[PDB]
């Protein structure tokens, strides 16, 4: 239904992300802290939930 | 056997365990069962006849189907033959205390076990196979008044007769 390398290239911008637990911010997948002042750099991070 | 059913030289051997007790469902109902002229009742009877007395414990059964019958061969596993040489009987019915008596001390049977090893483990002479088989078991692991840590490393016997 879609080309797989272009699907992975869309995954790199839409799904391969880190999400903070405090402010729910979308972060780069190599992150150990958060950017936002509003969460105080909480560093409680999770991977973004992959689609089934 | 690709198009619908053409047995030309069917000698398919696959890996299969749990052939000592017939169990409840026997794990034979899926696709391996009805494909290959293997019935369930005669197959369970022959599997029980191969997993008959001496020994009644769960072993590995490799099966050969010559279009009408199943020949089950038991490959000699070290833990399975140690648990078979463990003192019988303990299956159920005053079980639960538990499986780990361990009063065998593997006296003169590991020589024949090393003779019946099927050239596996990428081995040198039997001085390494002794240290493999002295640590692979998990019941008593050594003689009754010894420890398997720093005693198996010094063995001055059994270097020639094992091959």
């Amino acid at each position: 239904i879609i080309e797989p390398s272009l699907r992975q290239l869309a995954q790199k911008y839409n799904c391969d992300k880190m999400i903070c637990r405090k402010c729910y911010a979308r972060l780069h997948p190599r992150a150990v802290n958060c950017r936002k002042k509003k969460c105080g750099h909480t560093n409680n991070l999770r991977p973004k939930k992959k689609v089934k | 056997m690709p198009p619908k059913f053409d047995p030309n030289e069917i000698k398919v051997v696959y890996l299969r365990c749990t052939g000592g007790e017939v169990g409840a469902t026997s794990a034979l109902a899926p696709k391996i069962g009805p494909l290959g002229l293997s019935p369930k009742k005669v197959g369970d009877d022959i599997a029980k006849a191969t997993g008959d007395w001496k020994g009644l414990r769960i072993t590995v059964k490799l099966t050969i189907q010559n279009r009408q019958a199943q020949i089950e061969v038991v490959p000699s596993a070290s833990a399975l033959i140690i648990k078979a040489l463990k003192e019988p009987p303990r299956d159920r019915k005053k079980q639960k205390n538990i499986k780990h008596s361990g009063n065998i001390t593997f006296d003169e049977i590991v020589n024949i076990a090393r003779q019946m090893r099927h050239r596996s483990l990428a081995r040198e002479l039997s001085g390494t196979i002794k240290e493999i088989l002295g640590t692979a078991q998990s019941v008593g692991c050594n003689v009754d008044g010894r420890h398997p840590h720093d005693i198996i490393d010094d063995i001055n016997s059994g270097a020639v007769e094992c091959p």
């Binding site: 879609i2 995954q11 689609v51 | -």
Partner: protein, 190 residues
Amino acid sequence: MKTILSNQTVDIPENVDISLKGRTVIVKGPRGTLRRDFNHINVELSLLGKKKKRLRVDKWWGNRKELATVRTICSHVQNMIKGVTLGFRYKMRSVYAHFPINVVIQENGSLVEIRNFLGEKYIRRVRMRPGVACSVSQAQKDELVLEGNDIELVSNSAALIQQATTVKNKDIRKFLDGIYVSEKGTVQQA
């Protein structure tokens, strides 16, 4: 603490002519001129060697927040030399599930019309940055090429048409649609 000196040198090749009016550097060569005003950055920019072979950047008595700027000045100088000599070419592919995204340039590459994104009727017009040329390449189905000299302008122009094609009020993990940057290279390789 205050570190007494942080220095870094940039060896420019012979195809590049650079000069500086204070902290205002100008880099000219084959593809054109590029200026950058490093006022309010507060470093020392010396330019040494016969025919100005290297650009040396100094920071004197700066703590960590201003020691972190010597390498970014060096990186902007590398990117400007790369844009003058080899240029910047950003390739970006149109990923769609069902509706084919129709992209058409209008003047040369300045105004870009995006149509049929998620079956919408609203056309998406994007003005590019001055100096960025947009094109539809050959031997590839749905793919845009952004050519230019300034990496800032080319990548900002890529980010504009990447953020123009976003999916609203849906699951974007399922709706993987839009024009996404796939390759970042130069115009010529040399």
